Structures are given as structure tokens and as C-alpha cells.
Design a protein around this nucleic acid. Structure first.
Lengths: 262, 180, 124
RNA sequence: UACCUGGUUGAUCCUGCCAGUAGCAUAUGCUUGUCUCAAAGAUUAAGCCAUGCAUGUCUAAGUACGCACGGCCGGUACAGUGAAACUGCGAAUGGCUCAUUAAAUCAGUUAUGGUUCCUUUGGUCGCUCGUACUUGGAUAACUGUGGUAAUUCU
RNA sequence: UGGUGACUCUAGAUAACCUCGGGCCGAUCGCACGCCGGCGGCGACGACCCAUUCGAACGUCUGCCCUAUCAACUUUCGAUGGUAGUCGCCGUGCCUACCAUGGUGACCACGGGUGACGGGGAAUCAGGGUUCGAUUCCGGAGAGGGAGCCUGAGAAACGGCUACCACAUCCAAGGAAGGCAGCAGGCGCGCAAAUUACCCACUCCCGACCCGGGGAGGUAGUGACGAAAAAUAACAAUACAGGACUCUUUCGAGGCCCUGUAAUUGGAAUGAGUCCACUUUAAAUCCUUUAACGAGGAUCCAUUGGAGGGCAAGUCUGGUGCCAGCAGCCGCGGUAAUUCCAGCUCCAAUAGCGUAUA
RNA sequence: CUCUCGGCCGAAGCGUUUACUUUGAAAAAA
RNA sequence: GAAGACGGUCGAACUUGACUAUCUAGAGGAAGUA
């Protein structure tokens, strides 16, 4: 190419958007924004493919252009605006609030939350620097910078934002015994307790996580998001509790849902 | 770049020996017992069993407690039991190797129409299906190679918009009534 | 009187100001029911007027019994004029597309790139 | 479905190939009722190309003294809709082809603590101790006079 | 102060400098209107720098087909390295100056070829393999051949410009214009490949933008490349010097069950068609749904190859007479041809089936 | 297989160095 | 602040050689091919 690309073919779109083959050649191609385009939901896919409020992209244009969608407390008229992990999508007209949280199969769930919960979110601090007359700074996982954080906040911690002010209320430290969600790789969407972290210098660290049923899995350090302190999550968790069932017991649950219902 | 899909697949395989007596005789017997159109209809059913047996030949080589053998070995048995080719009590993975062509050819809709007393030969049944006289629970089926499942078997009838069922009489009876 | 209307996947869309649903049509002996007859049938189910409801995309199944389409039922008529594709407004006579073709517009666009300011409007 | 069969001799057993056999791709021949999906100027010539089209774009929110149309009610800076033109952005994406190219391209893996980055998103934007209740000159559109056989010329 | 596995990092402190081809420190626009002449609420457009996003670009390690009738190559004119610079967005022989004489190779360097763009993948397949991948996804390259640039965040851009080379257009002979390996279309080339059609309704992209545009893309057309389903008849009653089944020693008797090469009899059932209407769609078509019509030699007619062997199926009949021809191979044909040319019958696959080549 | 601290165990070393084997995570969609 | 000029650089192309390759016009002939 002679410059940056603007299209996305539909087959090369991310798998967890769950687009299908035959409706078009192109995928929505997210705008640049706070989240990575392999790691986001564009607002057009959330609003007609997940919520079924629209049937075309033209109707998503009509819904968004009435200024009806607030993502993290601000109105977005962009239909390909990249919403991402733990963003609060709040539709005021229908009185719904949503948070984007991965399912146990690594896709964003349609997780409804109460408007008490819709005033905060958790972020993961990715960078700390001191800049220009000794003012300390944060950089979170969704491109927020915060001036003057608490000096105990370090890289890989998890802070809590109030969505109106933008300021930190409190935070969790990165330690063994805290609760996780995996935000990357094979183990994506799983939830458990930190038990170990082995440090390889010059390369990626590996964190071992233990499930609520005693299953254990590793990730890398960058695929780790500290949800809660100890065992209590600071947010509401989706339908499955981050416990990935095997295919045999998922089949057993799906068959037990048919011999009882009907 | 078009928004199409080019996935397709052949349903039959031609035999390696083109003129082999005692293959021709056996396949002609299988045609005559079931009223098939040509030899490709026989080779189509040889192809599905050869894939089912290849799928069970590889599960039988894995460890007896392996998760793939326990998971895909139980889905493969469930489908054969469901379409009536296996028995319920025969749900071990080794009885798949004791399945035959005629066990699948019994479960065509054409033979079920003949065997349920709706027709009076295996050739009256195909010609009954093809001109829209047979339904399965609500739905008129045109297809003679419709593999009937074991629960959708007693719901086979005469398709209420047909002269043999609900009965507006046909084009020929109507004209003969108009004539005299 | 032998036709029936059912509604499966109902949802009140507050954003586009409509109710939207899947319509099941049961015409066990006749042809496919016309779109105006389904709107008369649906408006007395949902206690409205047929000019505010818009049904489309019906496919009769093989065998001939059932038909499945989609419908939308708007709050007002002006909401229907605002939030609709214009090809469905044109199916009720509430919109008229201009009748020029597309090869005429492209050749007229290219003929007036050869011309500076106010003579562009004098291009035939 | 882990497969062979004809052919050297008067007859035999071999070596050994030739020929047969089945698929799959391009062409071609003869034939063709129904219906679903569907490749399609790659191979020779990255040869040559009539004609048409394929890239443009305005919101409440950069600039309206075109009566172009209407329109206040008529001192009423500018009601409004608005072609044109200036300004801004896009035209570096997409589409096509496979000529070149043999540690090159490319793939997996790593790195930028050795760089640049329109845009989006967040931060920053009285941190500087030294006519403003608003500054200056132009130029299009428009009006008018033209040149050239001829251009999206001027 | 803070950080990294590691800084010559970040932050701090001091002395200055700060490019006229100047660095930031707002002379910009809308809406709602106001509170006590001042103080104002939402936006929009901006803007140095920092971070983020989309990238890009340079590097790391391992991996490629044939060729020795290619055995030494590289170093003059940078080859390998050192020091200092120049240029670059930056690291670096990238370039320059001065030094050192290095660097690669039978573990195949260097050179040549490729009917070579690379992968994901495809066909075939006991297991191992062998061959293909121009081609819708990703990456690269190139817009006749080379070269040079402008603008810009991004281009050595070609539906931008400037030359040369090769072609080629208009001319009043002075001059002017060009680039289909985009969509169609034409010529050529060939064994070899479709419409100068409709639309932005879908999928998305761009713009100042809910509004405009899009031969991207969608929709039809041509389409036996190829893949899936699936008609060309079914039934009954007669008749058979049929057949088998129960009795009869056997004849011969049965509604006992099947068969037919019966243009035997019989009305029953249907689609192919013709064709209203709806539905479909941007508008249409197609399919699906339904009216009415639509079958007896149901002439509403199934073909392509074969019939000695390999290899399923006629040493039946006439013609030919080593001729004409057949035959992948062995062979057939010379007056009785199981093999040619035909009739009849039979075999195989069947809306498909031969031939050529990889 | 062990040494100092942090809470009898971890942080600090590995044990000569590899091949091998099993695991884990990382590996675009189609 | 335009034309223009000295110089430098990048550098298509042009001419003359040398080597090498191909397409074409080309007398003569030979052998095998039958």
C-alpha cells in the first residue's frame, strides 16, 4: 500500500463478532479509537447483530444520529466507534445499560447492568510516567490518561473510574489471591483467582489462574485483568461465571434443558 | 470479490473396476428391491456408510477413555439410533462396523410409504411421492431419498390437498365428470 | 375468513418508534395473501390503522400452507415517513422517486466538468 | 476397498517395460426435459485499444450583494432556500494483473531501549512578568472587452 | 520523583542559544438565552506537545525448486571491518575521507535456468508420499519501457506532472493532446474464456455529511467449468399350449404369488408446458403459492459408446475380399470376417457420455 | 539440590551443556 | 519576486567500439528421408 487501509473484508474480520459469510463482502472496519480493532465491538454490530434493534446499517445510522447512545457517559454518533472491554453502553430512551464483558467462549455478551452500576468501570493501568514539573500520570487500557493518581498504583493494577468526573475512586493491586478475567488468547473470558506469577526477564511473564471449580490455566501477563479483590468481583458477572464447561458437560446441560422444558 | 461460497462436495464415488460381474448383479438387486433410478443412487448410499465406518474406525483406535472417542463416539451413535439404522440396545461403537447398505435403504421415505401400506409396490411409492401425495407431519415432501427419523415415522399421511387424502378430485376425474 | 395472522418475535422498538415482529400467515388452500390484506388483518389485531404499518419480505413455504414475513407498526405516520426506507414508502404512494436514469446523470455530470462557473447550469 | 489384467515361448518360470484401469483438470465432439448453487480473456500477447462510465463532497455551525426564487415590512447590517466560486477534506483506500523477483518476496517468531504517524480517544491549552468592543493588503464567482483551426487554453 | 532484565530513560538543577525559508502561547462559527455595565450555559472548528488507535519502515532466528557440460567468488567503480563525519524519519558502507585486508564457499558459495509472485490452501492417497496453487483471504509488486519529481500525514502516485525510448491521435502545418494489467466493449493471439445491461435497495467506503457519490459492491443476462436434488410413467382387469406354489400317480384343477417383446381393455394420478393473480425485488426476473387449460404409440420419441480378449454384452444376417477400413495393446480383414460397413438383438453409464493433453 | 530474607514453605542460586519426551501459551479467517 | 545563466547531483537516452544473442533476405551444396 501507499498509505493506511480503510476497508475490512468480511472473512478477515474478528471471529468473535460472529458475522456470517453471505450478507456482504465487507465488514464494518472499526474507527481508530480507545480499543484495538481485533479487540473491539463496533457499535453497528452491537446494535443490529446483537440487540436486533435495527435491520440495516441505515437504521443504525438513524438510531445513532438521534443522539440516543452513550458509551462511557458520552454521546457517540459514529456507527463504527470501537466499544471494548468494560465499556458502559447506555441507551437512555429504552432505559437499558450494558457492559461489554467476555463470555466463557470469548465473545462479548449482552450483559445488562443496573443504572447504579452504570456510573463506574474498571480500567487496567498500562503505563506510568512522570512528566513536565513532576506530575505523575497514568495510561489505562482504553487510552485514558489521569493526572495525579495515588502513588500506590503501579503498572498492571486495576483502578476504578467514575464516568462523569473521570477520576479514580479506588483500585485493586496485582497480587496472588485476587480475581481475574482473561482478556486474550485461548483462555479468553475465563475467570479465576491468581495463584502464581513466574517472571522471565526480557520476555513475557506467565500468570497461573485457578478456576472456581479447581481448574487451572496459565496466560501471559498482558492477558490478565484483575476484576476484584480476593473473591468478590467489583462488577456483575455474566450468565456463566467465567467457568468454561467442557463439551461433554455442555452437551449434558443442553440435553437436561430439553427433558425438563417443553 | 463476491459474497458467495464455493463449498460443494460430491456424494458418490465410482468403483475402480468398471465391468465386474457380481458387483453389477448385487447392485441391480439393490436397485430392484428398492426401486432406485440408477447406479449412482446406490453409490451415494455406499458413500455415506463408508464415511461413517471411516469415522468409527478411527475412534476405535483412540484410548477407550479419551475425550474425543467419548464425545464423537456418542454423537455418531445418537444419529444412527435416531434415524433408525441402529438399535437402542446396540449403542457400542463396534456395531457401526456391522451396518449394511440395506439398513440405510430401509429408511428412505419411498420404502416407508410402501411398507406402511400407503402404496402397493416400491414403484407406486416413488411416483406417489414425486407428484406431491405424501406429507410428513405437516410438510409435503417431494424427495424419495428422504431419510425418515424414528420419531417422525408414524406421522406419514396423504397430504390433505391430494385426491387420496382430503380430496379435491384430480384433473382427469374432473374432466370425465364434465364430459358425462 | 380462513386466513390467520400470528406474531412471533415481537419487540417494541423505542429508538425507531415502532413495534416490529415476524408475521405468520396461514392460507391453507389459497395463493399467497396480498400485502394489503395482511395489513387490514394486522391493524385490527393491534388496534390501529393500516396506513401506519409496513409489511415486507413474505415467503410461502414448500407445500403451500404457511407464509413468513416481517412487519413494523409505527407510532405516528410522520414517524413512519421519517424512519423508513423510501422504497417502502413508495409502495404506499407516499414517496415518488425522480424518473431520470443513471447513465443520464453520469454523462451530465461529466459534461459539466468541462465548463467553468455559471455555464454549468446551461449544460444539456 | 492396503486390488491388478492382456502382450516375448512349441510349452514353462522370470526380469522387464508397453497397453489396459480409476480419479482430477483445461479443451473438444455428440446429446440435453425440471430445479438449487456456481467458475468464467490466467496459460498464447504485462500485446494494442474506438466510445461511455469507474471520485467526489455542506451542516444549526468557514465565505452569499447571482431577484435564481420567494419574502418579511418596508430606514430596518445579514429573513430564508440557494447555483457558482473561494476555502477545507478525499482522490495513497478500493478494483485489476502476475511481468519481474530464488535468503529476495513470504511464513512462523521476535525487536524498535533505533524511528515516523492525517485521523480517533484521553491529557494539555491565564504556568511565559514583557486598534483589542476587532488589524492589513489582495483575489475569484459576477460585470465587461478579447485572442487561437483546435483543449477541463486562458 | 518514578521505571526497566538492562538507559546515555523519565523527571529535576545550572549557563546560554532559540533559524525572517520565524514554534506554541485562538483577531473563527452556531444555538439557547440570560443573572447582578459587568459575569455566564451548551456546542462547532482549531492548536505546539504527550499518550492511544490504524499503521508503516528497518532489523532478529529458522525455512525454497532444477542445475558442477557453473569451482572458486567478492575487492579498480565498497567488497568485509575500524574512526570521524555527511545524508536520512532513525540504526547501518547509505555515502565520503583516512586506515586495516578482510568476507563467502563441496554443510554447494558464485553463476545460470524455472512453461517461479510467496503463503493460507487443492487434487490424489493404506501408511509413507507425488503433483498443483495466475485465481475472490493475507503479504509483495507493476500500471507500455526506464528515469525524475510536485503536493501531502501518507505516493517516487500513473483515471498527477516532467523528460527520453517505442507506439499512437487532432491540425488551417503554426501547434495541441495520450496510457483499459478498473467496468463493459473491440482487434489480435490462439486449443482456450460472458452484457458497450439495471441499481446504490443490501454490504461497506469517502466527504463539510442522518441528505451527496461509489462499474467497490449488489441485481439480472450469457454460462453442460463444476457440485446438489430429480421426470421420461403407475395401477387394475383380461389373455398366456407363461413360471413357481396346494391337490391330482399324471392329465388337469385354484381370485395363491410373481413375469412378459400383449400398438390387449380400463379410467385414475401428475408434472413439463400455456398462463390470470399474488408473493419476490430498488424495479423486475427466477423459485415457492394458487386459478383455468395441459397425456396413450401418454409421437409430451434419451443419448453416448460398445458387443474376440483384457472388459459387461451375438463364431445371428447381408455387403467387402490384405481392399475399404477397424484396432490404446494382442490383433481382425487375402470369398464362411465372433473384430471392417449396415440391419436386428444384446451390454454399460445415463441427462449425460466419448476423444485429446497435463 | 540447596542458601539469606518475606510469609515449615516462596523470593536467590541452579543442576555441566544440549538432543529427546510430556505439558503449557502462542499461533487470522475461510 | 518571474525568465535566465555558472556549478553540482540523480539520470533516461544517444553515438562509436568489443563480445554475445535473435529475427529476417540470401547463392552453393551435401547426406539421410521415400
Amino acid at each position: 500500500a501507499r498509505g493506511p487501509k480503510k476497508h475490512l473484508k468480511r472473512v478477515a474480520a474478528p471471529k468473535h463478532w460472529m458475522l456470517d459469510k453471505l450478507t456482504g463482502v465487507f465488514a464494518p472496519r472499526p474507527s481508530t479509537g480507545p480499543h484495538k480493532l481485533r479487540e473491539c465491538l463496533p457499535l453497528i454490530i452491537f446494535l443490529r447483530n446483537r440487540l436486533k434493534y435495527a435491520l440495516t446499517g441505515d437504521e443504525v445510522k438513524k438510531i445513532c444520529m438521534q443522539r440516543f447512545i452513550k458509551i462511557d457517559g458520552k454521546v457517540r454518533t459514529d456507527i463504527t466507534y470501537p466499544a471494548g472491554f468494560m465499556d458502559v453502553i447506555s441507551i437512555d430512551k429504552t432505559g437499558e445499560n450494558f457492559r461489554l464483558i467476555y463470555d466463557t467462549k470469548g465473545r462479548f455478551a449482552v450483559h445488562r447492568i443496573t443504572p447504579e452500576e452504570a456510573k463506574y468501570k474498571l480500567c487496567k493501568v498500562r503505563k506510568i510516567f512522570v512528566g513536565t514539573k513532576g506530575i505523575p500520570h497514568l495510561v489505562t487500557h482504553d487510552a485514558r490518561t489521569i493526572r495525579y493518581p495515588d502513588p500506590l498504583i503501579k503498572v498492571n493494577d486495576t483502578i476504578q473510574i467514575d464516568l462523569e468526573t473521570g477520576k479514580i475512586t479506588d483500585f485493586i493491586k496485582f497480587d496472588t489471591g485476587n480475581l481475574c478475567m482473561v482478556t486474550g488468547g485461548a483462555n479468553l473470558g475465563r475467570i479465576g483467582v491468581i495463584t502464581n506469577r513466574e517472571r522471565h526477564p526480557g520476555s513475557f511473564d506467565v500468570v497461573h489462574v485457578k478456576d472456581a471449580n479447581g481448574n487451572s490455566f496459565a496466560t501471559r501477563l498482558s492477558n490478565i485483568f484483575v476484576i476484584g479483590k480476593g473473591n468478590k468481583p467489583w462488577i456483575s458477572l455474566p450468565r456463566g461465571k467465567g467457568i468454561r464447561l467442557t463439551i461433554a458437560e455442555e452437551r449434558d446441560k443442553r440435553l437436561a434443558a430439553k427433558q425438563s422444558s417443553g | 470479490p463476491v459474497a458467495r461460497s464455493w463449498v460443494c462436495r460430491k456424494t458418490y464415488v465410482t468403483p475402480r473396476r468398471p465391468f465386474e460381474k457380481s458387483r453389477l448383479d448385487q447392485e441391480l438387486k439393490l436397485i430392484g428391491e428398492y426401486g432406485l433410478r440408477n447406479k449412482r443412487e446406490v453409490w451415494r448410499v455406499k458413500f455415506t456408510l463408508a464415511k461413517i465406518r471411516k469415522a468409527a474406525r478411527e475412534l476405535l483406535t483412540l484410548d477407550e477413555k479419551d475425550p474425543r472417542r467419548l464425545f464423537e463416539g456418542n454423537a455418531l451413535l445418537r444419529r444412527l439410533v435416531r434415524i433408525g439404522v441402529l438399535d437402542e440396545g446396540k449403542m457400542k461403537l463396534d456395531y457401526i462396523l456391522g451396518l449394511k447398505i440395506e439398513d440405510f435403504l430401509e429408511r428412505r421415505l419411498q420404502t416407508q410409504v410402501f411398507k406402511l401400506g400407503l402404496a402397493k409396490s416400491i414403484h407406486h411409492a416413488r411416483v406417489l411421492i414425486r407428484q406431491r401425495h405424501i406429507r410428513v407431519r405437516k410438510q409435503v415432501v417431494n424427495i424419495p431419498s428422504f431419510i425418515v427419523r424414528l420419531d417422525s415415522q408414524k406421522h406419514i399421511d396423504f397430504s390433505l390437498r391430494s385426491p387420496y387424502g382430503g380430496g379435491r378430485p384430480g384433473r382427469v376425474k374432473r374432466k370425465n365428470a364434465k364430459k358425462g | 375468513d380462513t386466513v390467520t395472522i400470528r406474531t412471533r418475535k415481537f419487540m417494541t422498538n423505542r429508538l425507531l418508534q415502532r413495534k416490529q415482529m415476524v408475521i405468520d400467515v396461514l392460507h391453507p388452500g389459497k395463493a399467497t395473501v396480498p400485502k394489503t390484506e395482511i395489513r387490514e388483518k394486522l391493524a385490527k389485531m393491534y388496534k390501529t390503522t393500516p396506513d401506519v404499518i409496513f409489511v415486507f419480505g413474505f415467503r410461502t413455504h414448500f407445500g403451500g400452507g404457511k407464509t413468513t414475513g416481517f412487519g413494523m407498526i409505527y407510532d405516528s405516520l410522520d414517524y413512519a415517513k421519517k424512519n423508513e426506507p423510501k422504497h417502502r414508502l413508495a409502495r404506499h404512494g407516499l414517496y415518488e422517486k425522480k424518473k431520470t436514469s443513471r447513465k443520464q446523470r453520469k454523462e451530465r455530470k461529466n459534461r459539466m466538468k468541462k465548463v467553468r462557473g455559471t455555464a454549468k447550469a446551461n449544460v444539456g
